């Protein structure tokens, strides 16, 4: 015959070896693939979709779960008051878990790209005012007050003019490794922060509700990426 020497790894079964195997049904002609709308090809398509960010992830009472989707603003809040705050940690617990992006980050170990949060005011049409939305890069501590946050990368939002506004998070990178307990977790540290302060108070004419809610929607830019498939889940197929 033809001279050969078998090399180590012969007869082994690698769960990730993508070789070919013998077709059980050689003659079988599987029913032809026809056209179906919205085919997905690469998960990052999904990551660029706006999902509702449960910033108000505080109520747990079963019947108030719908409340996590929206946080509110009211007349009672005085100028300068901090409305709300959260981090730019897509994969870690908290707000991002609600977004689709967050859930997909979970099947991966590393990632990086620019994010993008959009706020939607759902209050009465007659209401007006200004909100200051500031981003404090990783490391920078949550600004003491409105004015100090006013010096950072911020955006004055007048929902009297535009009902929507989108903020871009320049960058977030879950790359810095951590071996705490005895379980190694490739964690953030890049917990960028997004604060939101009442630049002015909530103003309304008689006849309009003195409270309104807002909805956070997030997605990642086209420069987003992920690495290291890592299946992990609390939800599994029950016996």
């Amino acid at each position: 015959g033809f001279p050969t020497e078998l090399k180590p790894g012969t007869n082994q079964f690698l769960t990730t070896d993508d070789g070919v195997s013998a077709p059980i049904l050689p003659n079988f002609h599987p029913t032809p693939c026809i056209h179906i709308p919205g085919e997905v090809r690469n998960l990052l398509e999904l990551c660029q979709v706006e999902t509702i960010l449960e910033v108000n992830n505080v109520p747990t009472n079963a019947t108030s779960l719908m409340e996590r989707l929206r946080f509110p603003v009211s007349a009672q809040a005085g100028k300068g008051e901090l409305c709300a705050v959260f981090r730019a940690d897509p994969g870690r617990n908290g707000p991002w878990q609600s977004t689709l992006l967050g859930q997909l980050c979970g099947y991966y170990t590393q990632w990086s790209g620019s994010l993008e949060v959009t706020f939607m005011f759902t209050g009465s049409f007659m209401a007006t005012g200004k909100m200051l939305i500031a981003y404090t890069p990783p490391g920078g501590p949550l600004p003491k007050d409105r004015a100090t946050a006013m010096l950072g990368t911020h955006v004055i939002w007048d929902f009297g003019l535009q009902s929507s506004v989108t903020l871009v998070i320049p960058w977030i990178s879950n790359t810095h490794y951590r071996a705490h307990a005895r379980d190694g977790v490739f964690d953030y540290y890049t917990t960028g922060l997004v604060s939101i302060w009442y630049q002015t108070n909530y103003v309304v004419p008689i006849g309009a509700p003195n409270t309104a809610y807002i909805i956070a929607l997030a997605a990642a830019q086209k420069n987003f990426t992920m690495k290291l498939c890592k299946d992990a889940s609390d939800i599994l197929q029950t016996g």
Partner: peptide, 14 residues
């Protein structure tokens, strides 16, 4: 990734 092999089978290699 996991790989299986019998002690008899020559060395595993990846």
């Amino acid at each position: 990734p996991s790989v299986f092999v019998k002690l008899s089978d020559p060395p595993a290699q990846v």
